[PDB]
């Protein structure tokens, strides 16, 4: 599968001025566009070489749309302050994410459109793209408004049509990277804890996409105890890193194996000290 996602954050500035607005666009785990209200250009900007192919009409259109998005979020911050009976003195945050997935068959798989206020679920379009999950009575008010205005129907037209057409266009134009998997480069390190104990760390580096599974086995059976698994992290060059560790009795390192599953690996890998 593949995905296109846009992420929007607006943060009110009660001391002075309008909200800080940041928009970012992703295809899978690759950022391809940005807008920041604090930046100089006041344009949607490219963040991958393959989107720089797009002509002036594209960049003018996305700038117009992203600025309209910015203003909607400013208004939202005002509206929500009213719904929740909050003062003008405090800073608050709205977040919105939307986008689409195509499945293994390259056809529409799923669409998303969801919203949070101060980091809590507000309203989300359900998977059927015809109904809403409103978290509380403020979001219920939004739900009533959006149902009367046929918002779901408008979003569904985008998510099932235009959204997937954009995604497919981008996937072709950026295929050299977007449709290339980078298999994890793996190795093991050994860290003596005492005369009796040692930590084995299994490394996965320079992989894309970010999805990966690292598991330990002892004598060919899974082990969670005395293990540690770090959160997957960006290398900074568009690839990702992860490690898993297990503490073992010194001299028994041979018993343990690290197993790595990734889209770029035809069959999963096994490492052993």
């Amino acid at each position: 599968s593949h995905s296109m996602r846009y992420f929007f954050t607006s943060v009110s500035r009660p001391g002075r001025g309008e909200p800080r607005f940041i928009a970012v666009g992703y295809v899978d785990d690759t950022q391809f566009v940005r807008f920041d209200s604090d930046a100089a250009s006041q344009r949607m900007e490219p963040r991958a070489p393959w989107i720089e192919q797009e002509g002036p009409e594209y960049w003018d259109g996305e700038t117009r749309k992203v600025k309209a998005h910015s203003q909607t979020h400013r208004v939202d911050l005002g509206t929500l302050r009213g719904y929740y009976n909050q003062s003008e003195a405090g800073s608050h945050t709205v977040q919105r994410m939307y986008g689409c997935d195509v499945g293994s068959d390259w056809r529409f798989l799923r669409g998303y459109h969801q919203y949070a206020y101060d980091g809590k679920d507000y309203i989300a379009l359900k998977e059927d793209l015809r109904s809403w999950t409103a978290a509380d009575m403020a979001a219920q008010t939004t739900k009533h408004k959006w149902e009367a205005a046929h918002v779901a129907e408008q979003l569904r037209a985008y998510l099932e049509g235009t959204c997937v057409e954009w995604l497919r266009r981008y996937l072709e134009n950026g295929k050299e990277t977007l449709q290339r998997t980078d298999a994890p480069k793996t190795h093991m390190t050994h860290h003596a804890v005492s005369d009796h104990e040692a930590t084995l760390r299994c490394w996965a580096l320079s992989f894309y996409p970010a999805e990966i599974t690292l598991t330990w086995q002892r004598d060919g059976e899974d082990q969670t105890q005395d293990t540690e698994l770090v959160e997957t992290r960006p290398a900074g060059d568009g690839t990702f890193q992860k490690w898993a560790a297990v503490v073992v009795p010194s001299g028994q390192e041979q018993r343990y194996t690290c197993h790595v599953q990734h889209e770029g690996l035809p069959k999963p890998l096994t490492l052993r000290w």
């Binding site: 666009g25 259109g61 749309k65 208004v75 509206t79 507000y122 309203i123 959006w146 985008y158 954009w166």
Partner: peptide, 9 residues
């Protein structure tokens, strides 16, 4: 490409 019209809460 972005949504042409974003709904306000």
């Amino acid at each position: 490409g972005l949504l042409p019209e974003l709904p306000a809460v």
